[PDB]
Amino acid sequence: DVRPPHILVKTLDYIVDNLLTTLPESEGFLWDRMRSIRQDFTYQNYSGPEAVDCNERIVRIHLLILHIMVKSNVEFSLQQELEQLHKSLITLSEIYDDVRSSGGTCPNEAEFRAYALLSKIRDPQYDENIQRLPKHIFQDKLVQMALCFRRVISNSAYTERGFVKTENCLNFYARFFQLMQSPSLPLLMGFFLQMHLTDIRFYALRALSHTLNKKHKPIPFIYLENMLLFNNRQEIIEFCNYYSIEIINGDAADLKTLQHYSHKLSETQPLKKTYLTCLERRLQKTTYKGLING
Amino acid sequence: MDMANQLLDELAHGNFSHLTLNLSQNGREIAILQKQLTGFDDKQLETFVEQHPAMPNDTRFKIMCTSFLNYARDVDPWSAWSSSDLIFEFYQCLINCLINDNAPHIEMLIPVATRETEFIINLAGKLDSFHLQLHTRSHQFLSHISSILSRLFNSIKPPRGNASSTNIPGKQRILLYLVNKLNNIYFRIESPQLCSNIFKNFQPKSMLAHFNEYQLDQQIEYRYLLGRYYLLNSQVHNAFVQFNEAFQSLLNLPLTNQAITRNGTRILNYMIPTGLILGKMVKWGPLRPFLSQETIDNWSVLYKHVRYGNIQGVSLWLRQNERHLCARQLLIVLLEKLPMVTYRNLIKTVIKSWTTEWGQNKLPYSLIERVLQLSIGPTFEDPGAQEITIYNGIHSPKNVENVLVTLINLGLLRANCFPQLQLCVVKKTTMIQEIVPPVNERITKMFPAHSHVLW
Amino acid sequence: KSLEEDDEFEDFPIDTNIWEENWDDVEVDDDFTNELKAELDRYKRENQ
């Protein structure tokens, strides 16, 4: 009833080779079946090389799905995708711990420690865990990149039920959008970071609004679009309309009218996930299978 | 003379003088007991405990005695691993004799339990270091000990609101002791978040009306571990009051031992960076006996860089000190939270001469961009460092308005921003503290910590 | 060696103002502060 490790590898190979490009239409099929592969690994209590390889490439497929579903207008809500991606990252982390305890090594560990650092980008638990790993994992360029993103995303004014604000956070939104455009940024990591575009933009406009005097003119949409890297004007107009930011002159945002202090409005659903044009352009220049194979 | 019968008399009457796993204190008696107990099977030892006169009619107590007889019979002093099953089994039985508040000889068993707890913690570390050769997972022994001490901790109940006596039951006497032992275990196994429950249920279980009524050393260690926990969750003020009160309480202790000086050093290793994040700098006078001159020089270099607004200085200091800062979980929080203080002092020195001395009320973004060109120095975009680093990827002199906006939002700079004018307006005044208030007061007012005196 | 370097407190048999009042007022001329003041003078001079 259950697949041994080598045919789980054969099955994931089948998926990477045949069904990646059926996305976005095959998103539910692929997510369910990949989850079935991981479940077959748990059925046999197997944390061997096949489980590592499968969970790794499955994580990458989740990261690709995050961008594909959002570029199109198919699904909107990526709750299950982020949940199974996170659980797969937890599995990979535990297996990395057991392999290190046994004296072995995993060549792709650093990459998925970075992804793990991006799964819960405001949870200090993952900083705690990343600080006790070996120096070659910690100083790896991917882990360094994820750490930089965790620093620039930190915000002392981040508001959400159950989240304790921490001191002296950076809220470096400008640096965030500078790093998102970096050609050295791995594409799948970017796909993971696109999940926080709306939050980072909201707290950027909030923090900026607190610095403007009462009679300050509305901020033009050009400045906010270059500052927050909006794909087009319709996106910043829908953004202001979502957070009830008054649009004056059809091209300016009156930031003092922003009455919300939390990115998550109490009653309405979150604004649909968005993407960056640079990362989509980078996706059209490579292949899905290439990204999934590292 | 039958030494097993004798030991069973002593244990049956609460005399636990020879009830210990430490062979450095029990070696000869345990050897005699081992020679006399050879021959008898497990059921015969169990019968020896069951039918012994004056033996308390407690199943867990008799299980403890029988487990100690099995230990004494089968112990191999030449092999700590071969004897580990007997040792840990007996330890678990001994702690099991403490779960019931009215267990037989509970008050006499508590000191035995603390003693054996220290012993079994040392042995658990020793055996955990050989986890690869023993085919065990990392920290398995010590984690088992943590589970045992956790059940013991859960068994300790709060005082009855209308208690009939002032008796401090021995389970309450070792409450803070058990808290610090368990939390220390959680730190050594590198899972310190498990301290959460232990920190949440400590005060509700305590019968003492004031936290200062415990032994002051246990208070110091508790504030040390709680501050380290808070700092693990990036709660800098909450950690700071704990480190500060810990070091003060340590200053009150008479300097009997060198280990007290090293403990004070352990406190300072966290209190200095935590304070520096909150805009506080120590006076090295009362810290001379606890810190070497080189450590003082290091933190003094960082003190200069933060004091005069040198971001590149701060990042260089963190880069050179990266390893030991990561070992003490200090690199990330400093890398994240020192910059805003350093910026605050930078624009402090800028606004001082520009506004209070030169009488210019306006701060053009170009001026602050040149100042940031001097302070930040090189960035990821700049040539000569083509790979991104936590020390060159975060701070850029192009983001003038962002730095100003975070300074104003943190309450460190009282000013208005004009993005379309590209300038920052402060209040026309000669007093610099009206524009840039004291940083520690602002931070502590925005982030009020919990009561430094717990209760 | 490990007992003295580890962060866990050592066991010992059981038996004040230490902070700067204000380091903003006590100003000392720093090297970096000298180059920053010179940069303020040069900027003040190029933007007359």
From Swiss-Prot, chain A:
Superkingdom, natural source: Eukaryota
Sequence ranges assigned to domain PCI in this UniProt record: 80-271
Subcellular location: Nucleus envelope
Protein's job: Component of the SAC3-THP1 complex, which functions in transcription-coupled mRNA export from the nucleus to the cytoplasm. SAC3-THP1 functions in docking export-competent ribonucleoprotein particles (mRNPs) to the nuclear entrance of the nuclear pore complex (nuclear basket), by association with components of the nuclear mRNA export machinery (MEX67-MTR2 and SUB2) in the nucleoplasm and the nucleoporin NUP1 at the nuclear basket.
Further details from the record: Present with 339 molecules/cell in log phase SD medium.
Known partners and oligomeric status: Heterodimer with THP1. The SAC3-THP1 complex interacts with CDC31 and SUS1, and with the mRNA export factor MEX67-MTR2, the TREX complex component SUB2, and the nucleoporin NUP1. SAC3 directly interacts with MEX67, NUP1 and SUB2.
Entry similarity comment: Belongs to the SAC3 family.
Protein's name in the database: Nuclear mRNA export protein SAC3
Organism: Saccharomyces cerevisiae (strain ATCC 204508 / S288c) (Baker's yeast)
Included stretch of the parent chain: 254 to 547 of 1301
Curated annotation (Swiss-Prot), chain B:
Coiled-coil segments: none
GO molecular function: double-stranded DNA binding; RNA binding
Pfam family, one: PCI
Gene Ontology CC annotations of this record: nuclear envelope; nucleus; transcription export complex 2
Keyword match Transport: yes
Subunit structure comment from the entry: Heterodimer with THP1. The SAC3-THP1 complex interacts with CDC31 and SUS1, and with the mRNA export factor MEX67-MTR2, the TREX complex component SUB2, and the nucleoporin NUP1.
Note: Present with 1140 molecules/cell in log phase SD medium.
Protein name: Nuclear mRNA export protein THP1
Gene: THP1
From Swiss-Prot, chain C:
Inactivation phenotype: Impairs mRNA export and transcription elongation, and induces strong transcription-associated hyperrecombination phenotypes.
Protein task: Versatile protein that might stabilize multiple protein complexes involved in diverse pathways. Subunit of the 26S proteasome which plays a role in ubiquitin-dependent proteolysis. Also associates with the TREX-2 complex that is required for transcription-coupled mRNA export, and the COP9 signalosome, which is involved in deneddylation.
Gene Ontology MF: a single term: molecular adaptor activity
Miscellaneous section: Present with 5590 molecules/cell in log phase SD medium.
A single GO cellular-component term on record: proteasome storage granule
Subunit note: Part of the 26S proteasome. Associates with the nuclear pore complex (NPC)-associated TREX-2 complex and the COP9 signalosome. Interacts with CSN12 and THP3.
Source domain of life: Eukaryota
Keyword annotations: Acetylation, Phosphoprotein, Proteasome, Transcription
Protein name: 26S proteasome complex subunit SEM1
GO biological process, one term: double-strand break repair via homologous recombination
Family membership: Belongs to the DSS1/SEM1 family.
